[PDB]
Amino acid sequence: PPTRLSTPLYSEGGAFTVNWWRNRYGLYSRRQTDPMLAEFLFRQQVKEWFYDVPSYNYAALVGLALGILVAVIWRHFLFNPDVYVRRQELRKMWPDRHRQFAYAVPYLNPQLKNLLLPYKNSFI
Amino acid sequence: GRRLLHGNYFTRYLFGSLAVIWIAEYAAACQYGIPRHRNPNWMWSWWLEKQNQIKNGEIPANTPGYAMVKWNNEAEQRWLKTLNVEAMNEEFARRREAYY
Amino acid sequence: ISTSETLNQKILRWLDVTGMLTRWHSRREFILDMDPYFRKNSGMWTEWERKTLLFLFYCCTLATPYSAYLDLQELKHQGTKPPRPVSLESRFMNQRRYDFTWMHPQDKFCSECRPVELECKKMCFDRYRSMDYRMYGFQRPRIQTYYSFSTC
Amino acid sequence: KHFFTDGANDYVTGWENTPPLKFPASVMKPCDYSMTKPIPKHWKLRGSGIHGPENTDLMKLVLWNRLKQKRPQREVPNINYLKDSIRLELSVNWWLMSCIFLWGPWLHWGQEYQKVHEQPPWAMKRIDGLRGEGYFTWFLE
Amino acid sequence: EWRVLDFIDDELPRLLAEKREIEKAREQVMSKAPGDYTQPVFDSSVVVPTPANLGRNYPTLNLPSGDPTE
Amino acid sequence: TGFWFIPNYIWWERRYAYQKAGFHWEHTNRKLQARKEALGMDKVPASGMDW
Amino acid sequence: GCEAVKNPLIGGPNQKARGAITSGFAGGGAKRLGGKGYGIMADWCDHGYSFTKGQAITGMPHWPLWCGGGVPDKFIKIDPDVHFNLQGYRERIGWYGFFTAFLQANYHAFVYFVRFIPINIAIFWIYVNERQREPQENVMDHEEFFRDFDSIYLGQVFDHHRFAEWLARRRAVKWGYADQIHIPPV
Amino acid sequence: AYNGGYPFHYVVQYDDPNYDCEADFEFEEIPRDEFGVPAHIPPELSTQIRHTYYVPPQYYPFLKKLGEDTPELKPYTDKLIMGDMTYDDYEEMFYKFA
Amino acid sequence: YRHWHRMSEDDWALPLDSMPEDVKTLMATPQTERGFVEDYWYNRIRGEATLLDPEALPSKSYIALARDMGLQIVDEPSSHMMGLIELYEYLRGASFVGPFGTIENPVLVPAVGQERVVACTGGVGDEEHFTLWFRCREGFMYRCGECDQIFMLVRLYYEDRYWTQTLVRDTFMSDGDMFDLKTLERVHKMWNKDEMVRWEVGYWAQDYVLGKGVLPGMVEEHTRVN
Amino acid sequence: VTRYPSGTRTIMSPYPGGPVYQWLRINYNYFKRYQWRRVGRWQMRSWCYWKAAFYGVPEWNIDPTKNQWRWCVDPAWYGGMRDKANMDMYRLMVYPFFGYALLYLHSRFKQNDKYNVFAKWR
Amino acid sequence: RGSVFQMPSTPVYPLTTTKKVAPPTALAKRTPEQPFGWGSPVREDRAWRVVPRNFIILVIVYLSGWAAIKTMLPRGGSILGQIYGGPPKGRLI
Numbered sequence A: 001p002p003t004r005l006s007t008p009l010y011s012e013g014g015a016f017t018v019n020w021w022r023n024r025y026g027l028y029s030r031r032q033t034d035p036m037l038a039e040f041l042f043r044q045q046v047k048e049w050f051y052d053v054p055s056y057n058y059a060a061l062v063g064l065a066l067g068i069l070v071a072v073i074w075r076h077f078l079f080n081p082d083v084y085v086r087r088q089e090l091r092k093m094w095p096d097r098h099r100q101f102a103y104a105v106p107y108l109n110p111q112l113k114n115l116l117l118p119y120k121n122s123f124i
Numbered sequence B: 001g002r003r004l005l006h007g008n009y010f011t012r013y014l015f016g017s018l019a020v021i022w023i024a025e026y027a028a029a030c031q032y033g034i035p036r037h038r039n040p041n042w043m044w045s046w047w048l049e050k051q052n053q054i055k056n057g058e059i060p061a062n063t064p065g066y067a068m069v070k071w072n073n074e075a076e077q078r079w080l081k082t083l084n085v086e087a088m089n090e091e092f093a094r095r096r097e098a099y100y
Numbered sequence C: 001i002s003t004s005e006t007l008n009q010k011i012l013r014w015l016d017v018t019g020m021l022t023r024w025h026s027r028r029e030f031i032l033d034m035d036p037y038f039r040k041n042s043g044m045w046t047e048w049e050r051k052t053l054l055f056l057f058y059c060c061t062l063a064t065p066y067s068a069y070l071d072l073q074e075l076k077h078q079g080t081k082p083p084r085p086v087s088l089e090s091r092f093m094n095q096r097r098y099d100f101t102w103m104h105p106q107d108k109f110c111s112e113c114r115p116v117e118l119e120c121k122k123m124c125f126d127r128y129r130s131m132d133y134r135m136y137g138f139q140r141p142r143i144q145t146y147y148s149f150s151t152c
Numbered sequence D: 001k002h003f004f005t006d007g008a009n010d011y012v013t014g015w016e017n018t019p020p021l022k023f024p025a026s027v028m029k030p031c032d033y034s035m036t037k038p039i040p041k042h043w044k045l046r047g048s049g050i051h052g053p054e055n056t057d058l059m060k061l062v063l064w065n066r067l068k069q070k071r072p073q074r075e076v077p078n079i080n081y082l083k084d085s086i087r088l089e090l091s092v093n094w095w096l097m098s099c100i101f102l103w104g105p106w107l108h109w110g111q112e113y114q115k116v117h118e119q120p121p122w123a124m125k126r127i128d129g130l131r132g133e134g135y136f137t138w139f140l141e
Numbered sequence E: 001e002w003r004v005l006d007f008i009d010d011e012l013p014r015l016l017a018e019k020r021e022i023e024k025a026r027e028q029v030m031s032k033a034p035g036d037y038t039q040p041v042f043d044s045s046v047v048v049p050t051p052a053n054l055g056r057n058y059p060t061l062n063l064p065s066g067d068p069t070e
Numbered sequence F: 001t002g003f004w005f006i007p008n009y010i011w012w013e014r015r016y017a018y019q020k021a022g023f024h025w026e027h028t029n030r031k032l033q034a035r036k037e038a039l040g041m042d043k044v045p046a047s048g049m050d051w
Numbered sequence G: 001g002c003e004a005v006k007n008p009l010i011g012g013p014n015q016k017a018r019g020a021i022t023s024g025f026a027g028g029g030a031k032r033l034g035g036k037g038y039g040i041m042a043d044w045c046d047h048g049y050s051f052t053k054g055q056a057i058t059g060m061p062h063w064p065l066w067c068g069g070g071v072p073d074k075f076i077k078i079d080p081d082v083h084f085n086l087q088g089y090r091e092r093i094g095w096y097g098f099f100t101a102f103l104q105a106n107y108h109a110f111v112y113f114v115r116f117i118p119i120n121i122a123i124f125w126i127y128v129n130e131r132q133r134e135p136q137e138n139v140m141d142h143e144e145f146f147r148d149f150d151s152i153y154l155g156q157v158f159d160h161h162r163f164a165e166w167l168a169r170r171r172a173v174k175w176g177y178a179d180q181i182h183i184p185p186v
Numbered sequence H: 001a002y003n004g005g006y007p008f009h010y011v012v013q014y015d016d017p018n019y020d021c022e023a024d025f026e027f028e029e030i031p032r033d034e035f036g037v038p039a040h041i042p043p044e045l046s047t048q049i050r051h052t053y054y055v056p057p058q059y060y061p062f063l064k065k066l067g068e069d070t071p072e073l074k075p076y077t078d079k080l081i082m083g084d085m086t087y088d089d090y091e092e093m094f095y096k097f098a
Numbered sequence I: 001y002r003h004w005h006r007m008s009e010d011d012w013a014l015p016l017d018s019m020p021e022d023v024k025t026l027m028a029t030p031q032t033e034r035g036f037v038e039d040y041w042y043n044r045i046r047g048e049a050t051l052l053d054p055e056a057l058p059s060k061s062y063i064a065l066a067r068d069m070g071l072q073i074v075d076e077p078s079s080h081m082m083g084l085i086e087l088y089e090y091l092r093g094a095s096f097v098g099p100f101g102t103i104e105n106p107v108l109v110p111a112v113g114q115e116r117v118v119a120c121t122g123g124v125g126d127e128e129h130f131t132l133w134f135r136c137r138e139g140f141m142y143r144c145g146e147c148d149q150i151f152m153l154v155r156l157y158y159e160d161r162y163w164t165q166t167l168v169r170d171t172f173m174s175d176g177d178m179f180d181l182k183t184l185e186r187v188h189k190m191w192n193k194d195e196m197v198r199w200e201v202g203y204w205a206q207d208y209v210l211g212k213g214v215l216p217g218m219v220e221e222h223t224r225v226n
Numbered sequence J: 001v002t003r004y005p006s007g008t009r010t011i012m013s014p015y016p017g018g019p020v021y022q023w024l025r026i027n028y029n030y031f032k033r034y035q036w037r038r039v040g041r042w043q044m045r046s047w048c049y050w051k052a053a054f055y056g057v058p059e060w061n062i063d064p065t066k067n068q069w070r071w072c073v074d075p076a077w078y079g080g081m082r083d084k085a086n087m088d089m090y091r092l093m094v095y096p097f098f099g100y101a102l103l104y105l106h107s108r109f110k111q112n113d114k115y116n117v118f119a120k121w122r
Numbered sequence K: 001r002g003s004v005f006q007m008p009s010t011p012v013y014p015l016t017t018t019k020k021v022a023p024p025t026a027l028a029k030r031t032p033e034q035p036f037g038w039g040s041p042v043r044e045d046r047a048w049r050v051v052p053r054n055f056i057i058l059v060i061v062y063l064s065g066w067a068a069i070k071t072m073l074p075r076g077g078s079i080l081g082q083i084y085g086g087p088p089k090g091r092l093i
């Protein structure tokens, strides 16, 4: 982390980089009123939050939690036999909902259920 | 003049999200082997057979479904007392003659 | 029929009866149709800004008649809405734990009728009138009143 | 732009972090003294040295940010700026045109077809014997 | 000036005379040696605004003169 | 506090007694039956109207 | 109590001696009626634009913000020394003055209600005009509907004038006024 | 580059000496800008037209004295004497000596 | 400054209706006895009287010219005060960043009172520490207990008053020769003749010296309706 | 070049128009400028919601030191006696409110038969 | 008078030939009795009398009409009911 404003900061190209962050950090800021002061405050924030080793552990945890969350939502909509977004089957009585009954057995036998059920002998 | 979001953010994330939803759904159907042919009808086989008989002329037109079952509820017994399919057909025939 | 003008000019003149086209093609005419207080700020406008404003304003005002037509047809449709079958009272239909009184906590008018159930209220008002209590509404035939949207 | 941002769309006060590009660097320049050469040891600190109006560039920035508020004429922006200023307005207007001249016509055609054939022209005719128009969005069935 | 431009038909002879006098004055002051701050010699009666000629009371010309029915 | 409690108390007590006697239309109905008994007429004109 | 309440005036001499300022009007200095002046020039009466006369009474407000500035002393009418110092003001204004001041303190709320009520009256007119009319026949017999589904369900789209007349005759039969009305022919 | 190019404060001129934009409701008077440009000439066109400040010639000797005492100021004073100083030139002079 | 809102119309010029009507006494009042409005119109009347007399400008010294326009010739005393004033104002809505303070050059902490709360963040980089807040009272050379950064309080105080632009102008500016009303009249006739007024301020000012309502059209100018 | 009154002559055609056309154009121009716009001017000037917020507030003095009431007095009382009167009037309603609120408690207490706690078992 | 920014394009002051007497406020000066407002003509304060008068009248009409309707018309569910809510003429209840 450089301590002199003359020494530039390296930035990659893309949508999450040092240059991308600089453009947007001071959009709502009343304190970055001139180039010298703006750069000083920008580097102060970058030094404090992005050069902090332990902060990266939380980045991993949010990604993992969010990835699981998005996927469980998507899986319900796409595969759960009881979640309806289309209406064709909901305009018919229960005995006639064949297309929705097709999701039932495949959804009843997920891989992890087959892999972990044999390990009940470690609890009983 | 400084930009915060994608230059075309509204259309990008709207149409883009719709596209991902549609494509993901097709993939999900393929993996579970779900039948993708839309049927707009009920699947009660005996009923669909009675409807074919009406289309074939075996059962007179405008004959109610409760005039064909082997068990009637109370409200359908009330209706059967005032049901006259023959009169209904004659009335429709009269209307057609007047129209033409 | 005037022959001192072309056919195109005649059509444009008549579409300019209110001066809309003249104000579009003349900056001076547009600024002198502003009230003096706002004309003071006119000199700063660009021609891009001026004509774009007129375009947005003209598109809006020219679509108001269309929305008005669509709304009139809606009123006529609702004014002669077809009767629908009386609902059979199914397993989970018309469940009531207490009477309908939230509109009239103290008076408790039409406790058995629902808030916007007009036919139930009419018969209920008739009972109150037969009991010497005046209630308003549900007495004039629709075709004998103005703004009913039910006349042939 | 509609929303106010202190850094970019600062229309409440009109503050700008840097001077106009039209001005020569000898007249006015952005406040940036990061490249100042090392101070000789025999030089002595007279001022505070604190970042503030003692620096010429910062002083001129404050001065200009107040004296720019009165100008003889408008600084005409280019058409790109003008388009961006009313992007939503123009887009909504075109959306209204689409709703009248695109959505309107085919919606009318569907209802007229429905009148004669009981179901819209983009639906599968039923044989179950049920009555009524049925669904309208066929791809959500 | 724009206000004068509206009356250029009548002011043209004075404007041409004014142009000459201003040019004479500019030349005289520029050519003078440093430290010489004497006033230039010119006819100020044709230059506006000056003490010698403070201008004319121009009438507003924002008056319609045509009959819309013609 | 008590001074302004009295007028509210009096108003509510009369209102509460009235509400227990019946609905507004049940009250007007009792006066209608009495007027029908006084005149011996099965059907009388509604209040504010002539025969 | 005080002379000001006894003889209400706007911007007179001897305001301090009179004891109170009874007018909320601030500003002035216009050279003509409805002309450019100083101050905001707001009051319950005699301000703004007169609708009946089609004339301006006071000019547009001159705000004490960036768009404007201060008012010259020649035209100041609410002196803060007299406007404030409310010591024993109730005795100077009396009970009727207290009622007047309370009513005059709610000009902002009054201005709003004058702009808000009209649209709500219009909405209420929609309700009243509809409530007078007899209810339309929302529902009919379930069975009879399905025995004549096409006529009832589609009659409106095919011929709306005859469908309207048919509906009217059914309303006249449902409410027992058929012999008292003459339904216009279609 | 602020407020869309609209100056927060600007001068407006009126040909009629007794005109009031708040009292009158006439529809013929056309306001002018600080340079005198009528409002019906759009900004995009008027801003291209070159406007220069003309001081009375009696001021030329004073403007000459200023240039000589401060040689860095001479080029700006010369422009003013020769009627070549625009508003932008004046602004450059103003901020150069602050 | 960034913390200030938008210039008012008054920030540029004042309406001529705010000109004091007793111009004769206004031009004779000492500067220390003139209020804000009186001082504005004293400078404008006198400054424009000299600027609208072209034939005399070249022979007028910068010292005299600055006096007529009401501009204060700068000197080290006044520059110091004005500078510390503007530094105080800037710090109202701006960050406080500068060189590390030492005994030779302490961190300068401007204040009006006798105390101002200050925080030390240490040096640059790894020498930066957590904010250590302390109350900086006058008359003590403060030393941070952590980084040994020296601080000092500077008070904007002068003769039972704090430092303001008005105070600096009153203390250091000296009134020159009394303004002569003959100059006002002479310049007035120069630019105002035959219904043309090219010095509006001098037409109003001369009218007041004449007693208000004397010059043509001035009674009509002073007649208002509300 | 001849200049016609604003809004009276069309520029779309060399022909000014026929009698009916001219009547429509002239009279719409008059109706808009001198009849319809009476309502707008009346609403804009005489019924401004923002002018009404500054009603009764002292003038802003040009002398900066004569406006100290801005910070010496709270904004809720910038109106002098008018603003003090509004507060005082609402103050007079305190005890009437207490009696009204106390009545509601009595109403609920009675309707729930809580007064017959002892009479119930006597 | 208005903003310092609005101004006449040509700076002219009329040489009024009319002989009308000067309004008193036109020649006035600040005085100890009138620290402020000496340039504005004194006017009547109608609001002080008209606002409390008009408010009282409207309240009296509002309350009096309400009392009258609810005491001089037959009992009914609403005001519109008490006016237009009776049975048809000739319908005996």
Ligand SMILES: CCCCCCCC/C=C/CCCCCCCC(=O)OC[C@H](COP(=O)(O)OCCN)OC(=O)CCCCCCC/C=C/CCCCCCCC
Pocket: A069, A070, A073, A074, A076, A077, A078, A079, A080, A081, A082, A083, A084, A085, A086, A087, A103, B014, B015, B018, B021, B022, B025, D139, D140
């Ligand atoms: C703008 C142009 C016009 C666009 C018009 C669009 C009109 C219709 C819009 C409807 C709402 C949007 C979804 C459209 C889905 C279309 C395809 C479809 O029918 O999908 C059906 C399918 C399931 O259907 P069934 O067969 O009935 O169920 C079987 C058993 N489960 O449902 C879906 O996939 C759609 C519903 C879910 C939509 C969102 C995607 C799911 C995951 C959401 C994650 C949320 C957490 C955060 C995510 C962040 C980003 C990773």
Ligand SMILES: CCCCCCCC/C=C/CCCCCCCC(=O)OC[C@H](COP(=O)(O)OCCN)OC(=O)CCCCCCC/C=C/CCCCCCCC
Pocket: C070, D100, D101, D103, D104, D105, D106, D107, D108, D109, D111
């Ligand atoms: C040599 C090349 C020649 C090419 C010629 C191309 C000709 C193309 C002609 C296209 C005609 C399209 C006509 C569409 C008519 C629609 C009418 C209609 O539906 O009106 C009612 C409907 C609303 O009905 P509701 O009752 O409210 O019901 C729906 C909502 N509940 O109204 C609307 O949709 C309003 C909009 C009407 C749009 C009409 C479009 C006409 C387009 C003409 C194009 C001509 C192009 C010519 C090209 C020539 C090239 C040489």
Ligand SMILES: [Zn+2]
Pocket: I120, I121, I122, I123, I129, I132, I144, I145, I146, I147, I148, I149
């Ligand atoms: Zn430290």
